[PDB]
TrEMBL record, chain A:
<protein>
    <submittedName>
        <fullName>Vp2</fullName>
    </submittedName>
</protein>
TrEMBL record, chain B:
<protein>
    <submittedName>
        <fullName>Vp2</fullName>
    </submittedName>
</protein>
């Protein structure tokens, strides 16, 4: 029974090692909006008689 | 000044005899506990660095 207890203690320590890590890298990634209409900012002015 | 002589009653002799058996059981149990712990340290732990 004592040997069973000791081996369980040692086995638990041996399992405490760590395999790896995982993470997502996203810094600097910004979303893009979409612009439907091109701004022209033009106005046509005409005389009343069209001169 | 008031030293009193010692009377060894039969009950006192029996009392020590029961204690003698208990001490043996305690000494045997402690030695086994020490031996188990010494074996655990060798496999569970190693040397410590700074």
């Amino acid at each position: 029974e004592d040997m069973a207890k000791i081996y369980g203690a040692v086995a638990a320590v041996s399992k405490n090692v760590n395999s790896s890590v995982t993470y997502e890298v996203k810094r600097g990634t910004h979303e893009l909006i979409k612009v439907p209409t091109i701004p022209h900012n033009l106005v046509l002015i005409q005389s009343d008689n069209g001169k | 000044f008031a030293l009193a002589q010692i009377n060894a009653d039969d009950e006192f002799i029996g009392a020590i005899d029961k204690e003698s058996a208990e001490y043996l059981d305690e000494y045997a149990t402690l030695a086994r506990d020490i031996s188990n712990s010494l074996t655990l340290v060798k496999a569970a732990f190693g040397p410590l660095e700074r």
